Amino acid sequence: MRKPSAGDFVKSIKSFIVSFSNNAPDPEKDCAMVQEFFSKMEAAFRAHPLWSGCSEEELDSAGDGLEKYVMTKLFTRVFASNTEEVIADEKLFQKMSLVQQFISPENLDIQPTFQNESSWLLAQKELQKINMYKAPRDKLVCILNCCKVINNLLLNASIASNENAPGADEFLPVLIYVTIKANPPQLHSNLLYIQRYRRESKLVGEAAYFFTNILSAESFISNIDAKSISLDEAEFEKNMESARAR
Amino acid sequence: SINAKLVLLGDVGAGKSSLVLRFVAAFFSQTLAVNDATVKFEIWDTAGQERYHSLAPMYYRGAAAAIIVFDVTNQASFERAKKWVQELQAQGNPNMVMALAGNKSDLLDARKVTAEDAQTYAQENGLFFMETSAKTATNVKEIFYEIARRLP
């Protein structure tokens, strides 16, 4: 990347970091600047004569590279940079710490014909790798790797028990179970970070979809009470005490 | 030409996912071309279980279209289909091409909902009805085009 004719881009990508970071935090204003900045550079990488000479992966391999480096340096400025968000991370974690100890497939409507041995342990560990990456792309992959893992074992169960391939009647509930069991810390923040800073043009199709899934997984898990997981208002609360005591 | 977002709505046992399988997972792309205009279809599956009803709007946010499936052999899902279109009529952007599909007609005498019952309600509310079937490939290829024809 550090070719003796790249200096133009560096002086720009460096100068945006300073200009940008030296702004007081605003989630709307900030990310509109970043998604705004990415275009400026998008055209730029492709226009730049010294780069003749490229396919389409190569145009993205560049954009990913810019999404990454830039977001790395700007991470602690964009990620959970306000208080109301940090609280939502705390609130969720508490909820998920407790409910994981006693939730079962039925609560969320997962039929036995789709129940898994491991509790889809492999899916859980993919989400749990989320804070091991700083690039919006990489973070997203953690999520998509969770989704795929889920589908394979789900698809398997359909073959195993002769049914059709699985739809949202199967995926959404298992995603939740698996999110609760997983407790991927700083979720609320995480899902927004990716939402605000994944090169907008890539947050689309197959990806946008399963992202809306996990976003609605957060929502649901946030709102959990007896009724949303189908339990007596007695059982549910008692379980909460137990879980609290453990 | 036109990227387009479609949403399936309806309960379990409406079999919307058994339905779209003939149209070739929870999500399906399909670039479809009609009358020199070309439409890419982004089709989005939803969880049909009541306990998720209020997640629905996170999915149909920015929907170009929606298909509402019900079960013809089990009456109560037709009513759930009513509440759906009712909810769409109100919460989606008013420029939305909706379609009603009555699935599982693949049973030659079990059907509990009449063709008029369905045709009349659909007519009344600005959409068409189709008698969908997954076992006999009926009205799957078909239903997407009529919607395509109708997109801004």
Side-chain angles (χ1 to χ4, degrees), chain B:
Chain B
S1 210
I2 346 161
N3 296 345
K5 194 190 168 176
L6 219 149
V7 196
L8 311 162
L9 302 180
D11 24 60
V12 292
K16 43 186 159 49
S17 248
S18 75
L19 165 147
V20 94
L21 253 286
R22 201 40 58 89
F23 200 56
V24 304
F27 168 86
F28 270 106
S29 251
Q30 228 79 265
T31 326
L32 211 71
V34 321
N35 223 359
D36 110 276
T38 288
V39 82
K40 195 167 94 279
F41 265 140
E42 223 97 280
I43 300 102
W44 279 29
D45 204 346
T46 50
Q49 303 86 340
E50 179 62 45
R51 83 175 62 256
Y52 306 110
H53 175 79
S54 83
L55 297 193
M58 283 173 81
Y59 289 83
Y60 61 71
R61 213 195 203 196
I67 291 170
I68 300 89
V69 189
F70 64 90
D71 198 50
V72 304
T73 62
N74 292 257
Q75 180 67 31
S77 72
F78 171 108
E79 305 293 346
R80 266 262 48 192
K82 274 161 72 82
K83 312 177 231 295
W84 273 127
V85 179
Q86 277 192 52
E87 181 166 322
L88 284 183
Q89 271 162 17
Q91 302 306 315
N93 55 87
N95 339 275
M96 197 189 284
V97 182
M98 308 179 210
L100 187 62
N103 206 0
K104 273 169 190 160
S105 63
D106 325 37
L107 293 132
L108 257 160
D109 272 309
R111 181 164 165 151
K112 306 277 299 313
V113 181
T114 80
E116 191 173 307
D117 276 46
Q119 190 77 259
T120 314
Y121 172 84
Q123 180 59 232
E124 285 165 2
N125 278 288
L127 51 148
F128 66 86
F129 176 71
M130 267 199 172
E131 300 160 83
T132 39
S133 166
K135 239 137 204 155
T136 62
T138 351
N139 295 257
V140 171
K141 295 192 169 192
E142 298 68 14
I143 188 162
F144 286 79
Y145 277 92
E146 190 64 16
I147 297 164
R149 223 291 322 154
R150 308 179 184 214
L151 285 153

Side-chain angles (χ1 to χ4, degrees), chain A residues 121-186:
Chain A
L121 217 89
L122 222 70
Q124 300 174 46
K125 282 156 200 285
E126 286 310 314
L127 293 182
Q128 286 187 355
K129 281 161 151 172
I130 207 153
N131 279 22
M132 270 179 54
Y133 297 101
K134 278 181 140 72
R137 187 212 200 265
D138 295 294
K139 272 188 180 294
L140 201 151
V141 166
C142 304
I143 298 158
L144 289 204
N145 284 32
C146 176
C147 295
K148 303 195 197 170
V149 177
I150 293 149
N151 287 235
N152 290 324
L153 292 147
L154 278 197
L155 223 164
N156 276 337
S158 100
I159 291 155
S161 306
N162 266 315
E163 332 259 30
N164 308 301
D169 285 357
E170 286 89 23
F171 187 80
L172 193 34
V174 180
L175 188 69
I176 299 163
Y177 181 88
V178 151
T179 301
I180 290 165
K181 253 52 185 42
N183 215 334
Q186 296 185 306

Side-chain angles (χ1 to χ4, degrees), chain A residues 36-51:
Chain A
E36 187 159 356
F37 166 75
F38 282 163
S39 279
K40 208 312 289 263
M41 286 284 319
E42 198 158 2
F45 275 123
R46 121 202 280 93
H48 189 253
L50 323 176
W51 254 21

